[PDB]
Amino acid sequence: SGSWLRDIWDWICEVLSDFKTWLKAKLMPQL
DSSP: OOOHHHHHHHHHHHHHHHHHHHHHHHHSOOO
């Protein structure tokens, strides 16, 4: 047994910050 639920929680924290940068990177046109 272990803390699999918590393991995904921390992983989502990185994806949450990444999603914010991913949206800005995709919205940024060729410059």
